[PDB]
Motif scaffolding. Sequence first.
Motif, mmCIF file in Angstrom:
data_model
loop_
_atom_site.group_PDB
_atom_site.id
_atom_site.type_symbol
_atom_site.label_atom_id
_atom_site.label_comp_id
_atom_site.label_asym_id
_atom_site.label_seq_id
_atom_site.Cartn_x
_atom_site.Cartn_y
_atom_site.Cartn_z
ATOM 1 N N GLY F 1 0.957 -1.191 -0.109
ATOM 2 C CA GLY F 1 0.065 -0.064 -0.111
ATOM 3 C C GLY F 1 0.876 1.275 0.025
ATOM 4 N N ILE F 2 0.154 2.529 -0.136
ATOM 5 C CA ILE F 2 0.681 3.623 -0.007
ATOM 6 C C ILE F 2 1.712 3.818 1.154
ATOM 7 N N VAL F 3 1.082 3.631 2.221
ATOM 8 C CA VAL F 3 2.120 3.991 3.555
ATOM 9 C C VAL F 3 3.510 3.172 3.460
ATOM 10 N N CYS F 6 5.486 4.836 0.230
ATOM 11 C CA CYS F 6 5.849 6.249 0.236
ATOM 12 C C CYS F 6 6.101 6.850 1.478
ATOM 13 N N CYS F 7 5.537 6.415 2.834
ATOM 14 C CA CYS F 7 6.043 6.939 3.874
ATOM 15 C C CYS F 7 6.717 6.369 4.739
ATOM 16 N N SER F 9 8.775 4.165 3.229
ATOM 17 C CA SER F 9 9.686 4.281 2.260
ATOM 18 C C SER F 9 9.731 5.459 1.297
ATOM 19 N N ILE F 10 10.526 5.512 0.285
ATOM 20 C CA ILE F 10 10.487 6.799 -0.618
ATOM 21 C C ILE F 10 9.687 6.452 -1.982
ATOM 22 N N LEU F 13 8.242 10.148 -8.443
ATOM 23 C CA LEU F 13 6.977 10.826 -8.685
ATOM 24 C C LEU F 13 6.071 9.624 -9.457
ATOM 25 N N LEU F 16 4.235 7.798 -6.883
ATOM 26 C CA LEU F 16 3.140 8.476 -6.455
ATOM 27 C C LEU F 16 1.815 8.481 -7.427
ATOM 28 N N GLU F 17 2.240 8.554 -8.594
ATOM 29 C CA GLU F 17 1.445 8.624 -9.870
ATOM 30 C C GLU F 17 0.506 7.208 -9.780
ATOM 31 N N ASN F 18 1.031 6.106 -9.183
ATOM 32 C CA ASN F 18 0.439 4.866 -9.087
ATOM 33 C C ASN F 18 -1.012 4.866 -8.312
ATOM 34 N N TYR F 19 -0.999 5.992 -7.513
ATOM 35 C CA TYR F 19 -2.163 6.210 -6.738
ATOM 36 C C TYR F 19 -3.125 7.154 -7.127
ATOM 37 N N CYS F 20 -2.894 7.538 -8.341
ATOM 38 C CA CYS F 20 -3.756 8.454 -9.144
ATOM 39 C C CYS F 20 -5.234 7.580 -9.919
ATOM 40 N N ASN F 21 -6.353 8.129 -9.839
ATOM 41 C CA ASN F 21 -7.621 7.600 -10.603
ATOM 42 C C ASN F 21 -7.369 7.595 -12.234
ATOM 43 N N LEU L 6 6.991 10.939 2.669
ATOM 44 C CA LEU L 6 5.646 11.602 2.629
ATOM 45 C C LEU L 6 4.734 10.729 3.317
ATOM 46 N N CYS L 19 -1.714 14.077 -9.114
ATOM 47 C CA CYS L 19 -2.921 13.499 -9.764
ATOM 48 C C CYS L 19 -3.819 14.345 -10.595
ATOM 49 N N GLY L 23 -7.794 12.975 -9.625
ATOM 50 C CA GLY L 23 -8.053 12.506 -8.322
ATOM 51 C C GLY L 23 -7.224 11.318 -8.177
ATOM 52 N N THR L 30 -3.921 -0.306 3.628
ATOM 53 C CA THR L 30 -3.706 -1.205 2.534
ATOM 54 C C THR L 30 -2.329 -1.578 2.688
#
Lengths: 21, 21, 21, 21, 21, 21, 29, 30, 29, 30, 29, 30
Positions: F1-3, F6-7, F9-10, F13, F16-21, L6, L19, L23, L30
């Motif tokens: 997951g994102i935490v 990205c939180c 671990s680093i 860009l 991060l874009e993998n979490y966009c819709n 972050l 994004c 969005g 998760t």
Amino acid sequence: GIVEQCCTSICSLYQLENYCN
Amino acid sequence: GIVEQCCTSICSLYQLENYCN
Amino acid sequence: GIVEQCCTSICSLYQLENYCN
Amino acid sequence: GIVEQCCTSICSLYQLENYCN
Amino acid sequence: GIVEQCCTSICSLYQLENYCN
Amino acid sequence: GIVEQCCTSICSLYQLENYCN
Amino acid sequence: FVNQHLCGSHLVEALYLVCGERGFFYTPK
Amino acid sequence: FVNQHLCGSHLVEALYLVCGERGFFYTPKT
Amino acid sequence: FVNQHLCGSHLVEALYLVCGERGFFYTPK
Amino acid sequence: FVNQHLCGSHLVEALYLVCGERGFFYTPKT
Amino acid sequence: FVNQHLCGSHLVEALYLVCGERGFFYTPK
Amino acid sequence: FVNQHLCGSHLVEALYLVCGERGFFYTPKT
Ligand SMILES: [Cl-]
Ligand SMILES: [Cl-]
Ligand SMILES: [Cl-]
Ligand SMILES: [Cl-]
Ligand SMILES: [Cl-]
Ligand SMILES: [Cl-]
Ligand SMILES: [Cl-]
Ligand SMILES: [Cl-]
Ligand SMILES: [Zn+2]
Ligand SMILES: [Zn+2]
Ligand SMILES: [Zn+2]
Ligand SMILES: [Zn+2]
Ligand SMILES: [Zn+2]
Ligand SMILES: [Zn+2]
Ligand SMILES: [Zn+2]
Ligand SMILES: [Zn+2]
Ligand SMILES: [Zn+2]
Ligand SMILES: [Zn+2]
Ligand SMILES: [Zn+2]
């Protein structure tokens, strides 16, 4: 005070509301 | 009040200080 | 630089102002 | 300037990068 | 949508909760 | 997951874009 | 005209920095 | 004014407030 | 029209993220 | 609502949201 | 009228706090 | 773009910026 309750410890929503006017 | 004074115009640091304790 | 002065050490208001244009 | 270009319209990441060093 | 409902008017905490998972 | 990505671990860009819709 | 809700959010962050250890009351109305 | 460590976006926000119409420069690698 | 003061506050946070280690100058005028 | 430590500007932002039109007081030295 | 871009930035921070561990989807359009 | 950890609201703000109109989803468990 708020620092002891919510910053160095954790405030529930109800506890944060104690600092509202 | 702060909204009346600092939303309409930009308050400087010195103007903002008025609202501190 | 600013990181050494204000992030890993503490900047007074006067020291932050050194980074203004 | 950045205010003229990025306050009026939304600047993409790529447009914002122009303002970096 | 959230923009239509919570940009036009201020959504309370309870109204914002609708958008949570 | 994102935490984890990205939180703790680093995230680049692109990551991060993998979490966009 | 200015969006009061967004303005206030901004103002309290500015007061955090300006007031420091003195703190502040935020009374919008 | 606060007397505390200011890093990253919090440092940039502090500069925005302090510097006003003058603007500022944020150079972290200096 | 856009509130320039609120817009600028937002812009410098966005520049922090976009510019990273390169940094930036914020020159509103 | 989050269950986490809230300090400084993040604590103030949380109070702004939670308290609404009532406003709040941030007294760190208390 | 409200600046949607600034409003959304604010909204997602509010959702972070309100939703906590549940998370959220932000779908502006 | 920054290359740093972050978390929390700073992670959400980064996603908002990255994004755009698409969005995003913030799912911390998760
Ligand atoms: Cl705003
Ligand atoms: Cl201000
Ligand atoms: Cl932080
Ligand atoms: Cl400011
Ligand atoms: Cl932006
Ligand atoms: Cl809020
Ligand atoms: Cl809100
Ligand atoms: Cl953005
Ligand atoms: Zn703890
Ligand atoms: Zn120290
Ligand atoms: Zn690391
Ligand atoms: Zn704003
Ligand atoms: Zn510190
Ligand atoms: Zn922070
Ligand atoms: Zn301001
Ligand atoms: Zn914690
Ligand atoms: Zn809000
Ligand atoms: Zn880190
Ligand atoms: Zn933006």
